[PDB]
């Protein structure tokens, strides 16, 4: 991985990181996933999660895929199906 080094001088910081506005990613084994809060995982099947954030969506690895913001308004209703393939 890289080494995002953020320095603050004047009201304009540079980094040779902010939070993810209601963003989520699809956790999986692949190549682990930690967090500087308390919990951390070194393994896993398919499980997504949202909420906290310090991670920077790296074009290299963002666990699987990334999805920002909360879309659906008030009136937007959604119906879901069971699924399964083959």
Partner 1 sequence: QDNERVLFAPVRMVTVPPRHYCIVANPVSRDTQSSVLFDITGQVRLRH
Site residues (CB under 8 A) for partner 1, limited to 6-45: 6-8, 16
Q: Binding a second copy by CB under 8 A: which of 5, 39, 47, 81?
A: 81
Contact partner, 37, from a second copy, partner 1, none, Cβ < 5-8 Å per class: a second copy
SS (H, E, C) 2-52: CCCCCECCCCCCECCCCCCCCCEEEECCCCCECCCCCCCECCCCCEEEECC
Q: Binding a second copy by CB under 8 A: which of 29, 34, 40, 68?
A: 29
C-beta pairs of 75-80 under 8 Å, 24+ apart in sequence: none
Q: Binding a second copy by CB under 8 A: which of 5, 36, 47, 77?
A: 36
Note whether 78 binds a second copy by CB under 8 A. Answer: no
Q: Which residues bind partner 1 (CB under 8 A)?
A: 1-8, 16
């Amino acid at each position: 991985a890289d080494q995002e080094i953020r320095l603050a001088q004047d009201p304009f910081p540079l980094y040779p990181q902010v939070v993810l506005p209601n963003t989520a990613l699809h956790l999986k084994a692949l190549l682990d996933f930690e967090d500087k809060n308390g919990d951390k995982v070194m393994a896993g099947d398919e499980w997504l999660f949202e909420g906290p954030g310090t991670y920077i969506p790296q074009k290299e690895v963002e666990v699987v895929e990334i999805i920002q913001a909360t879309v659906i308004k008030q009136n937007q209703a959604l119906r879901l199906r069971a699924r399964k393939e083959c």
